[PDB]
């Protein structure tokens, strides 16, 4: 008996402003105070938001390292590992939101003459919470393009952190590919134009994805082909527009061209922008992730309406996720995917939302190419059954008496650290959590070491990581209840 090999990692989510809207590092005795409160519990690090409107705010290539340097020591000093977000979106922005922090403003002042650096909806409206993929390429910037900016953000980054990175505090960069540090479009903006659970829209009219559009019909003899203007708006169910509804026009050869269109977008940008950051971080002993987006409204129904507009072109007979964990491969990237805590049972009932299956869905996906999977919690939980959930999801097939399980999550991330975490109730309610993930075991300072980074294999095209898509194939079993549940 040896159960060593079920321990799962947890990672806990530092505050949105850990370093101040203004850039510098304000809260650190808080902070201390909190981490305290962490390592009491067992956890494994911490994972934090690297904001680009903080460290690039002054101009191209000023970065202002200062507060992140004084942040990761204070990590350091509590023995805790770090995981960093390339995070190359806007923080909040939204009704209601506390912490608000743009973009670099200096970028934005392109988007004066060049409206189009923006994602932007069937009605014009331009979001500004990150770039259009569509400026990937394009070297609008002072002139350099919006990938060049990334891996310059990401090699300044290295530069300056390379003793945390050596010393084994920085084991994980995950690389922000949109909205909220997602790889996906803003279809559901929320404040915005968009409430929960509105199908969303196609955020494909900035003029850079139009001539893309434009470029691919033409290539296939079809100039004439336009994005579907049967899709109805943001707060639409399905049924309400032509395109999404049963046996709608999203089944057409002109739908599903529009569809793989749409999505392969998604995952080249995630490709061009990993290989980047796969050639800065070249060596060093951390894990590459990308975030998906848990998409869990209209998984019921056909159309998948939501994973649709948000990029993930998922079906009953399409693996939309296993297309992206297939273009992942060569770079040895892991999924950090959500909605760990969340049960059907606990969703509306109008959503006609499957977060489980989801979950199980993604994680199959991951797994069947050879990925690390790793989740985040959806919503603040801080109950026994949202724990439990999380760790049926960690060990799908439960602990394995004598080595390691046939499936498990390389790490969870919880979202996310406050003072209402680290007291009373909610408290005893997490470390029981933390003690079950680690298998009863105590923190162990070496699990999970890191290999040197490899370069990122041959580049393969997307018809090739098409070939994933289908046959769907079913998930792997998980267990209806963790075998070791909190108490
Ligand atoms: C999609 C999932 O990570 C939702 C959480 O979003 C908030 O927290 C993350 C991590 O701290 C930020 O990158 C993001 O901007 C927040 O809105």
């Known amino acids: 008996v040896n159960v060593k090999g079920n321990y799962v990692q947890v990672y806990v989510m ?32 911490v994972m934090v938001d690297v904001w680009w409107g903080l460290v690039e705010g002054k101009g ?66 331009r979001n500004i919470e990150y770039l259009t993929l569509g400026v ?17 953000y990401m090699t300044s980054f290295r530069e300056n952190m390379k003793e945390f990175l050596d010393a084994g505090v920085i084991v994980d960069i995950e690389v922000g590919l949109g909205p909220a540090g997602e790889m996906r479009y803003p279809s559901y903006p929320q404040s915005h134009g968009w409430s929960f659970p509105g199908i969303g829209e196609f955020i494909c009219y900035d003029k850079y994805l139009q001539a893309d559009f434009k470029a691919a019909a033409a290539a296939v003899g079809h100039p004439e082909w336009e994005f579907p203007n049967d899709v109805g708006q943001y707060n639409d169910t399905p049924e309400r527009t032509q395109f999404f509804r ?3 026009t999203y089944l057409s050869e002109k739908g599903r061209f529009f569809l793989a269109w749409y999505s392969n977008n998604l995952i080249k940008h995630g490709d061009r922008i990993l290989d980047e950051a796969n050639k800065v971080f070249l060596g060093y002993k951390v894990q590459l992730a990308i975030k998906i987006s848990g998409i869990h409204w209209w998984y ?41 805590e969340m049960r059907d049972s606990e969703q ?15 994680l199959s996906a991951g797994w069947r190419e050879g990925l ?13 059954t949202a724990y439990n959930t999380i760790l049926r ?84 079993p998980f267990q209806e209840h963790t075998d070791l549940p909190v108490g």
């Open 300 to 340: 019921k129904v056909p159309s998948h309406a939501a994973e649709l507009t948000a990029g993930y072109y998922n079906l009953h007979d399409r693996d939309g996720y296993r297309t992206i964990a297939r273009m992942l491969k060569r770079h040895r990237a892991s999924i950090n995917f959500t909605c760990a």
């Open 14 to 45: 530092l505050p949105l402003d850990a370093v101040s809207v203004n850039n510098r590092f304000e809260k650190g005795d808080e902070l201390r105070a909190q981490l305290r409160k962490l390592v009491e519990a067992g956890v494994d690090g």
């Open 60 to 125: 191209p290539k000023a970065y202002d390292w200062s507060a992140y340097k004084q942040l990761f020591e204070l990590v350091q000093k509590a023995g805790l590992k770090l995981q960093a977000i390339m995070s190359f979106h806007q923080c909040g922005g939204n009704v209601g939101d506390a912490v608000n922090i743009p973009i670099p403003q200096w970028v934005r002042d392109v988007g004066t003459r060049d409206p189009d650096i923006f994602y932007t909806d069937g009605h014009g409206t």
């Open 393 to 476: 999801n960690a060990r799908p097939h439960g602990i394995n008496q004598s080595g390691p399980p046939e499936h498990k999550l390389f790490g969870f991330t919880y979202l996310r650290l406050s003072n209402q975490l680290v007291e009373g109730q909610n408290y005893a309610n997490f470390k029981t959590f933390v003690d079950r993930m680690h298998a009863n075991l105590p923190r162990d300072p070496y699990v999970d070491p890191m290999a040197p980074l490899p370069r990122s294999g041959p580049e393969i095209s997307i018809e090739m990581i098409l070939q994933a898509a289908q046959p769907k194939l079913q998930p792997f």
């Open 246 to 248: 049963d046996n709608g």
């Open 372 to 384: 690390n999977v790793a989740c985040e919690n959806a919503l603040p939980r801080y109950d026994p």
């Open 136 to 152: 990937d390429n394009q070297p609008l910037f002072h002139g350099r393009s919006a990938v060049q900016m990334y891996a310059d």
């Open 348 to 362: 509306s009932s109008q959503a006609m939302s499957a977060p489980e299956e989801l979950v199980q869905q993604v």
